[PDB]
Structures are given as C-alpha cells and as structure tokens.
Amino acid sequence: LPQLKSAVDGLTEMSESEKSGFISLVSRYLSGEWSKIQTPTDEIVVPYEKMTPVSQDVAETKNLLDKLVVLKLNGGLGTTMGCTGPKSVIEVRDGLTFLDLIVIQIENLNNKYGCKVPLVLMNSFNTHDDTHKIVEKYTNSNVDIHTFNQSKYPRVVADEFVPWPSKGKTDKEGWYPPGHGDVFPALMNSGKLDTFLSQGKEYVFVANSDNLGAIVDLTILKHLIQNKNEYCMEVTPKTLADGGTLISYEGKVQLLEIAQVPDEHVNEFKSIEKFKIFNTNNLWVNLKAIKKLVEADALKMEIIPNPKEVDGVKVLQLETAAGAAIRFFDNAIGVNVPRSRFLPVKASSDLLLVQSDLYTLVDGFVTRNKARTNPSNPSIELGPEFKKVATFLSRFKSIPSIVELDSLKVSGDVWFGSSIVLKGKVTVAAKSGVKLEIPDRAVVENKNINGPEDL
Numbered sequence: 001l002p003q004l005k006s007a008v009d010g011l012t013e014m015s016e017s018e019k020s021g022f023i024s025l026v027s028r029y030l031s032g033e034w035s036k037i038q039t040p041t042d043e044i045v046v047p048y049e050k051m052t053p054v055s056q057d058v059a060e061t062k063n064l065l066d067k068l069v070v071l072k073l074n075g076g077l078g079t080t081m082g083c084t085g086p087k088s089v090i091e092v093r094d095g096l097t098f099l100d101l102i103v104i105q106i107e108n109l110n111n112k113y114g115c116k117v118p119l120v121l122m123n124s125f126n127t128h129d130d131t132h133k134i135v136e137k138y139t140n141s142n143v144d145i146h147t148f149n150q151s152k153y154p155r156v157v158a159d160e161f162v163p164w165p166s167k168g169k170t171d172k173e174g175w176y177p178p179g180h181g182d183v184f185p186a187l188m189n190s191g192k193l194d195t196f197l198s199q200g201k202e203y204v205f206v207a208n209s210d211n212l213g214a215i216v217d218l219t220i221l222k223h224l225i226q227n228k229n230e231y232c233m234e235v236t237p238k239t240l241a242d243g244g245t246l247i248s249y250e251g252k253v254q255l256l257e258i259a260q261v262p263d264e265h266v267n268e269f270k271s272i273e274k275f276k277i278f279n280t281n282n283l284w285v286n287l288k289a290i291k292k293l294v295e296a297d298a299l300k301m302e303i304i305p306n307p308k309e310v311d312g313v314k315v316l317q318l319e320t321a322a323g324a325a326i327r328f329f330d331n332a333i334g335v336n337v338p339r340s341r342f343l344p345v346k347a348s349s350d351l352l353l354v355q356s357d358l359y360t361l362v363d364g365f366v367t368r369n370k371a372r373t374n375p376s377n378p379s380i381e382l383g384p385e386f387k388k389v390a391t392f393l394s395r396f397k398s399i400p401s402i403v404e405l406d407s408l409k410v411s412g413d414v415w416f417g418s419s420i421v422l423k424g425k426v427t428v429a430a431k432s433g434v435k436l437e438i439p440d441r442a443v444v445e446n447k448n449i450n451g452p453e454d455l
C-alpha cells in the first residue's frame with residue numbers, strides 16, 4: 001500500500017481528495033453469512049400504497065418541493081446504443097431527449113407550485129464536455145441546471161497491481177469513473193452539496209438518466225420529511241426478467257448483490273420467490289446526512305472490481321454503488337413501488353416500447369396507454385442489426401402498434417414498413433443472406449415469419 005500511495009501521489013493530474021478516495025477503495029479491496037439473511041418487514045420496506053399522499057393544500061406541496069434537488073446520474077455514454085456523447089442526449093420520444101423531458105417535468109413543477117427545484121447532472125470525464133455545451137440550450141428554461149464531474153481514478157493494471165497512468169497511460173483510457181456510489185463523495189467534493197444546503201435544500205432524488213419512470217413523487221418526499229428517513233431506496237417487485245435486492249442483515253437494511261452470494265446459494269438468490277424485490281436506483285437521500293457521513297469517512301460500500309481489457313491491457317476498475325450506501329444512514333427504508341416507476345432505456349428494443357402506441361407524452365412525461373390489458377410490457381428482442389439508434393430507426397418506417405403484443409423476437413436482416421400491427425407472440429427470422437421486408441399495414445398475430453414464403 002505505501003508504494004501504491006507514492007505511485008498515486010506521483011499522478012499530479014489527480015486532486016488530493018481523488019487520491020485519498022482511491023487509496024481508500026484500494027486499501028479496502030486488498031483487505032476485505034447466508035443463514036443470517038432475513039426478509040425486511042413492511043416497516044423497513046414500506047409498500048408504496050400504505051404511504052399517505054399530500055393534502056390538497058398547494059402550500060404543503062410547495063414547502064416539500066422547496067426542500068428538493070433532482071439529480072441525474074450522467075456519467076455514461078451512448079455507446080451500447082451506437083451513439084457518441086452521453087446517453088441522456090439520445091432522442092427518446094417525439095424528438096425530445098431524456099434531458100429535454102427531465103427539464104420539462106421540472107419546469108412544470110416550478111410553474112405549477114412556485115418552487116425553484118434545481119436539476120443537477122453528475123457527469124464523468126467521459127461526458128462532462130458534451131454535457132456542458134448541451135445544457136446551455138436550457139439557459140432561459142424555468143429551472144436552474146447544475147453540473148459537476150465525479151471522481152476520476154486510475155485504472156489499475158491487474159497483474160502488477162500498479163496504476164496504469166504510472167506505466168504511462170495518461171490519456172483518457174488510463175482512467176475510469178468509480179461507479180455511481182461515488183455520487184456521495186463527488187457531491188461534497190464538487191461543492192454542489194454545500195450550494196444546495198445554503199439554498200435551504202434538504203433532500204436529493206437520485207436516478208439513472210435513462211429511467212423514464214423516475215419522476216418526482218410527492219408521496220415519497222412527504223414520507224421522508226414527516227418520518228425523518230435519511231435514505232429511501234425505491235424497490236419494485238422482482239420479475240423473471242430482473243437485480244440487487246434489499247435484505248435485512250445484522251439488524252440493518254442492506255443491498256445484496258450476486259457478487260456477495262456464495263456459489264452454493266447463487267441459484268436461490270435468483271429465485272424471485274426467495275427475494276421478491278429489486279433496486280430501481282431511484283434513491284432519496286438526506287443532504288445533511290451525506291455531508292456528515294462523507295466528512296466522517298463512513299461510507300464503506302462493497303468494492304466492485306469491474307475488470308476490463310482495454311488497448312490490450314487487463315485492468316481493474318474498483319467502484320461502488322449508490323444503493324449500497326443505504327446501510328450507513330439513519331432510519332433508512334425501502335419503498336416498494338409499482339413498476340411504472342421503473343422504465344429503463346438500455347437498448348433499441350426499449351426505444352421501440354417507448355416510441356410505440358404503448359405510450360404517449362403528456363406534460364414531458366412518458367405516459368402508458370391505459371388501453372393495454374397486461375400491466376407488463378411486451379418483451380422485445382432485436383438482433384444486432386438494430387443495435388445503433390440510427391439503424392433501429394431506419395428499419396422501422398413507423399413504430400408498429402404493439403398494444404396487443406405479448407412478445408417480439410427479430411433476427412437477421414429485417415426491415416419494417418409503416419402502420420404495422422403486431423399481436424400475441426411474434427417472431428421474424430431472416431436466414432443468412434436473406435433480407436425480409438415486412439410490408440406496410442401488415443397485421444401479424446401469433447406468427448413465426450421465417451422467410452418470404454411466410455409473408
């Protein structure tokens with residue numbers, strides 16, 4: 001460890017608090033009970049439906065809102081989805097980006113109630129420049145937008161265990177942002193937590209930039225303030241399709257990830273029958289509690305190694321998760337929310353869902369079509385032909401109707417025309433060297449289309 005510290009102190013590009021923060025993760029990493037796991041009670045993981053909504057007194061709502069900061073995690077790139085820049089600036093619905101919609105929602109809150117709720121974006125050294133030029137578009141918007149850069153840590157060469165920039169990899173690829181658990185130290189380090197405290201704010205609502213369900217929820221905010229919950233994680237029921245779970249362990253609610261489960265217990269962990277809930281990454285956190293625990297160096301989340309191979313070299317990228325911080329705060333709870341609060345956009349297939357007749361946009365919010373029977377969204381699986389946002393859009397002249405869809409799987413070189421209707425279970429599979437065009441106004445129900453012979 002003394003050699004690692006010297007090496008890090010040799011990296012003059014690192015801030016003093018980044019160096020100490022990194023050595024602290026490294027130290028913990030280099031150092032360090034299934035039968036004890038319990039299901040949380042309903043008082044620790046509160047069903048959303050038991051929470052008291054705000055009264056009709058608009059003044060009560062304004063006073064809750066005056067205490068709030070909305071934060072979006074914005075440290076990630078549009079790379080999975082074939083886009084350069086930050087994921088948040090992908091157009092998600094009606095030509096509006098994730099960031100456009102977040103801004104609209106907050107404007108509408110401020111207009112409706114007379115509050116001045118700010119928006120803050122946590123960027124990384126990979127997204128900060130693009131984001132900073134983009135946010136100028138909201139200069140005259142009815143919301144103050146703050147940005148800050150999270151920590152920038154050296155990738156560590158796995159074998160020798162030395163900082164990669166110490167071996168001369170000082171360009172962008174030598175470094176990494178150490179996960180969303182870094183939100184707590186970065187908020188302090190950047191100065192932004194102090195600015196909001198000085199503005200009389202008390203809580204931050206943190207969410208993934210690409211979660212379209214993560215809207216300010218007055219019922220939760222009310223609960224935190226009335227009941228003095230310093231941390232509240234939104235969890236949602238676990239489905240076959242899902243996730244870190246909340247457990248009760250040694251008297252505390254804690255995040256449990258598969259990484260910390262013994263091999264013999266991994267299959268039971270994946271039972272949506274044993275663990276019924278999972279973390280949405282919608283997190284409500286008391287700002288004074290954050291300052292106190294960060295300054296006391298008390299946030300000791302599980303280390304996630306996240307190994308990668310970059311430019312030939314195998315590296316470690318020690319990180320932490322924001323949800324794992326729950327066990328350090330006072331009177332922490334989960335709240336078990338309807339899945340309406342969890343609509344992630346991770347791939348083109350999710351764009352198909354949200355750009356379809358399954359949703360519309362109301363007042364900046366992606367709003368589910370009430371005509372659909374199933375409360376669950378249909379499963380959409382698309383081949384790599386559809387991976388890039390541009391290519392996805394090119395393969396759909398319009399987004400087909402899917403209100404009556406159970407599932408779609410598409411593979412091979414497939415192109416969709418306009419005004420298509422899909423129902424029940426649908427597969428479209430173009431063989432090697434075949435291009436399949438689904439014609440305009442096709443109605444496809446409970447069908448496998450395996451070639452032109454099938455339509």
Ligand SMILES: O=c1ccn([C@@H]2O[C@H](COP(=O)(O)OP(=O)(O)OP(=O)(O)O)[C@@H](O)[C@H]2O)c(=O)[nH]1
Pocket residue numbers: 072073074075076077080087122124177178179180207208209210345346
């Ligand atoms: O270091 C980090 C990590 C990630 N994040 C942010 O945490 C949230 C969840 O981070 P994920 O990595 O789980 O979401 P993603 O959608 O970027 O995942 P991929 O499909 O690309 O694998 C996202 O909003 C991301 O931008 C950060 O802000 N900083």
